[PDB]
Design a protein around this ligand. Sequence first.
Ligand SMILES: Cc1cc2nc3c(=O)[nH]c(=O)nc-3n(C[C@H](O)[C@H](O)[C@H](O)COP(=O)(O)OP(=O)(O)OC[C@H]3O[C@@H](n4cnc5c(N)ncnc54)[C@H](O)[C@@H]3O)c2cc1C
Ligand SMILES: Cc1cc2nc3c(=O)[nH]c(=O)nc-3n(C[C@H](O)[C@H](O)[C@H](O)COP(=O)(O)OP(=O)(O)OC[C@H]3O[C@@H](n4cnc5c(N)ncnc54)[C@H](O)[C@@H]3O)c2cc1C
Ligand SMILES: Nc1ncnc2c1ncn2[C@@H]1O[C@H](COP(=O)(O)OP(=O)(O)OC[C@H]2OC[C@H](O)[C@@H]2O)[C@@H](O)[C@H]1OP(=O)(O)O
Ligand SMILES: Nc1ncnc2c1ncn2[C@@H]1O[C@H](COP(=O)(O)OP(=O)(O)OC[C@H]2OC[C@H](O)[C@@H]2O)[C@@H](O)[C@H]1OP(=O)(O)O
Lengths: 445, 445
Amino acid sequence: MATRIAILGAGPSGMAQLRAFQSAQEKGAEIPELVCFEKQADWGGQWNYTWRTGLDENGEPVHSSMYRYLWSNGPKECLEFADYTFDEHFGKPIASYPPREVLWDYIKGRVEKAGVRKYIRFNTAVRHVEFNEDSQTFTVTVQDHTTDTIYSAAFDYVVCCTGHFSTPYVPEFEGFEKFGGRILHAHDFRDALEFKDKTVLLVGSSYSAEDIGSQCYKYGAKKLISCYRTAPMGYKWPENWDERPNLVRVDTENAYFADGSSEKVDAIILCTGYIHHFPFLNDDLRLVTNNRLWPLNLYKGVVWEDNPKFFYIGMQDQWYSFNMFDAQAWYARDVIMGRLPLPSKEEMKADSMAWREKELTLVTAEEMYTYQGDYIQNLIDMTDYPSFDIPATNKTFLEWKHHKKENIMTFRDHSYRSLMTGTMAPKHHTPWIDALDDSLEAYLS
Amino acid sequence: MATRIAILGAGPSGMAQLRAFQSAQEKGAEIPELVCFEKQADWGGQWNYTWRTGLDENGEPVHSSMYRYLWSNGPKECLEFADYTFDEHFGKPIASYPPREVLWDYIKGRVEKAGVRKYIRFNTAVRHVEFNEDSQTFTVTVQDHTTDTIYSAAFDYVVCCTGHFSTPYVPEFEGFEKFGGRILHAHDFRDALEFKDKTVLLVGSSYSAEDIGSQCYKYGAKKLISCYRTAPMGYKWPENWDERPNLVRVDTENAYFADGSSEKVDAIILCTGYIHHFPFLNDDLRLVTNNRLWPLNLYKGVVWEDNPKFFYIGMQDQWYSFNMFDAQAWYARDVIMGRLPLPSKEEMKADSMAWREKELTLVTAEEMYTYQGDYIQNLIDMTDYPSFDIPATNKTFLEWKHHKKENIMTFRDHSYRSLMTGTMAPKHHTPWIDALDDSLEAYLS
Ligand SMILES: Cc1cc2nc3c(=O)[nH]c(=O)nc-3n(C[C@H](O)[C@H](O)[C@H](O)COP(=O)(O)OP(=O)(O)OC[C@H]3O[C@@H](n4cnc5c(N)ncnc54)[C@H](O)[C@@H]3O)c2cc1C
Ligand SMILES: Cc1cc2nc3c(=O)[nH]c(=O)nc-3n(C[C@H](O)[C@H](O)[C@H](O)COP(=O)(O)OP(=O)(O)OC[C@H]3O[C@@H](n4cnc5c(N)ncnc54)[C@H](O)[C@@H]3O)c2cc1C
Ligand SMILES: Nc1ncnc2c1ncn2[C@@H]1O[C@H](COP(=O)(O)OP(=O)(O)OC[C@H]2OC[C@H](O)[C@@H]2O)[C@@H](O)[C@H]1OP(=O)(O)O
Ligand SMILES: Nc1ncnc2c1ncn2[C@@H]1O[C@H](COP(=O)(O)OP(=O)(O)OC[C@H]2OC[C@H](O)[C@@H]2O)[C@@H](O)[C@H]1OP(=O)(O)O
């Protein structure tokens, strides 16, 4: 086919985008030339673990925010590919909340099967994307770190897949320049063992704080302190872990909270989340948003409204994840291919405004993942992407919510049914708190 | 003047470039318009300390490599402005090896005096510099993080001052993904107290290894271990500090050397240096070199030979430093202003080749700083920058060498005379090992 496409990033989303085109071709259609650029030496994005921190071996910002002993925080059943099942990949049932290495193996399995590795240029950082009015094409400039060469190439469309949980939001507190312990962001957190026998303040009250706390807890930290800005997380933590209102300052050794309280602290971890940052785009192409279920300026959450030859995959906040990226990649594919022509700019705006109105109505966690599910439904209904039971995927989310509330440290110890196959997942061979080994090999025997 | 100049960065180099222009104007010349861009909230470069690590508050790679308790490692007398003396800044003699905050105050003071702040756009990262063949102008694209806007602007010349000790060289050793302590690069080193009562592996044998060990030692580390790749540093270290051949792998808790030895380690600090990295340049403009006294492709060490309307300040390795940047900035100024016209491309090449042949001749630390002083001498002779006594600066380095050999932990306790004023620096009020407070106010009272 005539056109040429650039895919930025080879994590879940970039992988999904390649997989969609490969599926079209398998079903016998003529597809566009495809070039995918990836700065790391392998695919999988967040899921590709690294010991590195800050800046990688080439000087690019280190991308992955993942740590030793990370395991899935939601049911694997909620993120199964509708076109490549857990049954198929592993050839047997496994429990509901696999470690990192395990879900990494599984996402790679689909793209190894699909043969799409050949499209990817690894160890290549994307530096600039420019749209040229005269030719109606994009110029993509990249740095190949294998050859140490900077070069560019022209493309008829561009799909951005570079993630939005990699560039840290890192607020400052009074005294950080005097504190003698380590200060780091959740993004920098690697092995919980570095904190065995220590007192660790975790600043913030979301998924980052919840899990990094647990890992420090699980691996012997003397004591834990979470501070919240708005409201407490609210779970019943173990004995040596307590919650209090915000940090307000720190000194050579101590932390002070709005409590009036205060104590000795050895390390501070900022679990204050991330920013959407696209250093390779100018203001004509660059999405500016806070983290949320509905960023503005994206038709069907995917098409950039000022230049609809540019697409974004996976830039919403994530209740659903892998199968959301699929539904987005299938939709992007079909517009690029001519199968779903775009409406007028006014029409896109009116649609996008109606989704945002509904977003702002949203109050409870249940209302939120359901909304995201209605979004996914609408996308998969437009595409030969296989439909699956979204209302039951939400009930699975509901269950998970209850398990977390019942007991924060044992939610991972439960099991759920695949919406793709029907099978119930078997209980894991070891309780969470005792499963100290994070390796694939030990999870599967 | 008709022309417009961009200065990239506002550390010592950027500061020196502005100051050079300011000086000419003060003596009555018409000067170009100047725009200087700086990604941090304030000037000073390495010398502007931050507690931050990896990526700053805006997503930009954090720039400074400086830690708590850093002091000058060479005689202040070797880095004094020939146009702005230590007497004039501080109003009174002071010792020879000032703490960071103290040299920071001193470099700002020249530029506060000069009134050149008004030329700087702070909190602005340079993304891209392109040369347009049609206009013979550069387009500079930047991101203003105050307004969150990306915009560009056209310049007749560009002076790059973004440094080369900020992007870390970070080799991998077998086992790093399995070790449970902190691994970090010298660039990420902040407060030595994070390592009180610990055993610390320091990988490397140069200025970073020397001085980061010494701070870990001075603030109460249990034990130190340096490993070298080529040759030992060879200084007499305290009892709990020992040197040995290179690291070769690591496990859950331990380090293994070529010794065949091995022991328990809590943290690893890669003191392996830095890479010249310019993400905002294509290959037509982009210097590529290892760290050394004579990079190729720079006429007089400063004019980019493939496009001589683009200049680099201070990209050499640094024995001299602040007065080298001034000699360079003064030279750049004069070429930009038309005072010193350039020879042909062939003659630049022959001249640079002659400097590289001599660079290769160099064996002893003395031959090296003498070569850099021959370099600086040839630069300052071309310009109204005030000549100063290089032979005598060299002798002050020689004295410095011997004191470090004599005793690595007390070289900071000596004093030397100013080549600018003649005055002998008084002994400091506290010996190094005991002066635990790094503050300007404590150093000055
Ligand atoms: C700590 C953490 C834990 C998480 N846990 C879960 C979980 O348990 N379950 C779940 O469903 N989701 C989880 N997530 C959600 C995560 O966002 C998705 O799982 C998924 O990783 C996002 O896919 P992506 O491909 O869109 O982005 P990413 O996985 O972030 O991939 C981005 C890719 O783009 C590349 N890239 C970026 N910039 C450039 C550039 N300039 N040039 C070249 N390449 C570039 C990166 O190398 C990377 O390969 C977690 C996220 C984090 C941060
Ligand atoms: C740990 C350490 C200790 C040192 N100690 C000494 C010492 O004791 N004595 C001595 O003489 N020298 C020392 N040095 C040497 C040091 O390089 C020089 O003194 C001086 O800092 C070099 O000045 P510079 O302006 O050329 O570079 P820098 O000080 O590094 O300045 C670079 C500037 O450019 C900015 N910049 C970079 N990229 C961008 C961009 N994309 N957009 C906008 N701005 C950008 C940075 O913010 C920074 O302000 C030390 C260096 C290090 C790393
Ligand atoms: N200054 C300050 N003081 C105290 N607290 C602050 C401050 N600034 C932000 N925050 C809190 O940090 C948290 C950020 O949460 P989140 O965005 O989900 O980020 P996560 O890293 O937890 O990522 C979650 C997602 O990534 C992967 C995972 O699966 C989820 O999809 C949240 O509680 C914040 O606001 P608030 O006022 O605290 O409500
Ligand atoms: N793979 C590996 N294994 C072990 N050791 C390695 C390895 N790779 C490099 N190195 C050593 O790291 C050190 C880097 O030296 P330097 O360039 O002075 O960087 P610094 O940060 O010390 O220099 C700071 C400079 O900045 C400012 C200061 O004033 C100096 O001018 C040096 O000893 C290296 O070469 P070698 O083979 O080890 O000799």
